[PDB]
């Protein structure tokens, strides 16, 4: 089966702001990747093995709005640049890659899956360079192997002249280490 | 919701069309030089290529385009008119073998459909099933390069 994805917006600007202050989100959750928003930026959060993970530079140390009020982070690691909350009820988790493939696929905020070649433990190159504006909002998103298992979480673009030729990611290994600490 | 694959029909048959790069592509042996229907009347083909068994019209309403493959994977996936996904191992520029052979019936009416890579990107257009005694074990396809080239 080929990797395909689709996006659905669940709420708007004002509803987002209210929910941010209230910390109470009664909306129904579905999917493996959640489109997430603070008051300053929107990025992604991936559910892997029951934990909803995202980028620390995006979430900081914030709680996540849930139907039971705000939920404190389960994990925080300023160094690995990770934060994790319990996966929301309704979400579906991806599972870590166990095939060691180097042919990866990044899922963007717009639900496009782009191929990247693993060129290191935390780097991969875009087979088709794209402007960084395309990658804007994808931090925390998943890098999948051909089987659809999680290899890493998109962290930063390696860009020049405004075009990204490579990406920097947090390999799934750092996740286990963060939980272990 | 918008679709990348259109299930199309002529008076004679039914097959598929795939939208790639803003063009609705299909097999010349299905459509011919026929025109495509629209609420404002028929729209003529933008591209006709009997040689490559390829024709294309401007993408219709309710459709979205597929992105061409750029990863060169050989693990392809053919999508049928019933939305069935069939894993195909690429054997050549325009040939691939079904990982698990299927009776011809299973692949009937799917020409024009897409052959996707692990990223869901267009690798080629299903041109014809290569079968032995009613069993499709391989398929012929039009690589995206031809489409990109024809444009």
């Amino acid at each position: 089966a080929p990797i395909t994805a689709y996006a659905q917006q669940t709420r708007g600007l004002l509803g987002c702001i209210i929910t941010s202050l209230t910390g109470r989100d009664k909306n129904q959750v579905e999917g493996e990747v959640q489109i997430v928003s603070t008051a300053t930026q929107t990025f992604l959060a991936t559910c892997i093995n029951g934990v909803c993970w995202t980028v620390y530079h995006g979430a900081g140390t914030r709680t996540i709005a849930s139907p039971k009020g705000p939920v404190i982070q389960m994990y925080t690691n300023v160094d690995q640049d990770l934060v994790g909350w319990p996966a929301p009820q309704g979400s579906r988790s991806l599972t870590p890659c166990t095939c060691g493939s180097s042919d990866l696929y990044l899922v963007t905020r717009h639900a496009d899956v782009i191929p990247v070649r693993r060129r290191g433990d935390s780097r991969g190159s875009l087979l088709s360079p794209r402007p960084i504006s395309y990658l804007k909002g994808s931090s925390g998103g998943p890098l999948l192997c051909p089987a659809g298992h999680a290899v890493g979480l998109f962290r930063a673009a390696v860009c020049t002249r405004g075009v990204a030729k490579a990406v920097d990611f947090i390999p799934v290994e750092n996740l286990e280490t963060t939980m272990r600490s | 919701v918008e679709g990348e694959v259109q299930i199309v029909s002529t008076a004679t048959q039914t097959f598929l069309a795939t939208c790639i790069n803003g063009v609705c592509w299909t097999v010349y042996h299905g459509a011919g030089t026929r025109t495509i229907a629209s609420p404002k009347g028929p729209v003529i083909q933008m591209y006709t290529n009997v040689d490559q068994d390829l024709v294309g019209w401007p993408a219709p309403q309710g459709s979205r385009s597929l992105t061409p493959c750029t990863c060169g994977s050989s693990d392809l996936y053919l999508v049928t008119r019933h939305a069935d996904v069939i894993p195909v191992r690429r054997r050549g520029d325009s040939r691939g073998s079904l990982l698990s052979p299927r009776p011809i019936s299973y692949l009937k009416g799917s020409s024009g459909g897409p052959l996707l890579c692990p990223a869901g990107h267009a690798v080629g257009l299903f041109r014809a099933a290569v079968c032995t005694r009613g069993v499709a074990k391989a398929v012929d396809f039009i690589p995206v390069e031809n489409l990109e080239t024809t444009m």
Binding site: T19, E32, Q34, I35, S37, L44, T54, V107, R109 | D84
Partner: peptide, 22 residues
């Protein structure tokens, strides 16, 4: 400081489907 809010979702578990008519 405010809570992180889910404003959308991306679904990877979907498979090719014929868009139903209504």
């Amino acid at each position: 400081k405010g809570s992180v809010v889910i404003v959308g979702r991306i679904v990877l578990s979907g498979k090719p489907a014929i868009i139903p008519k209504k």
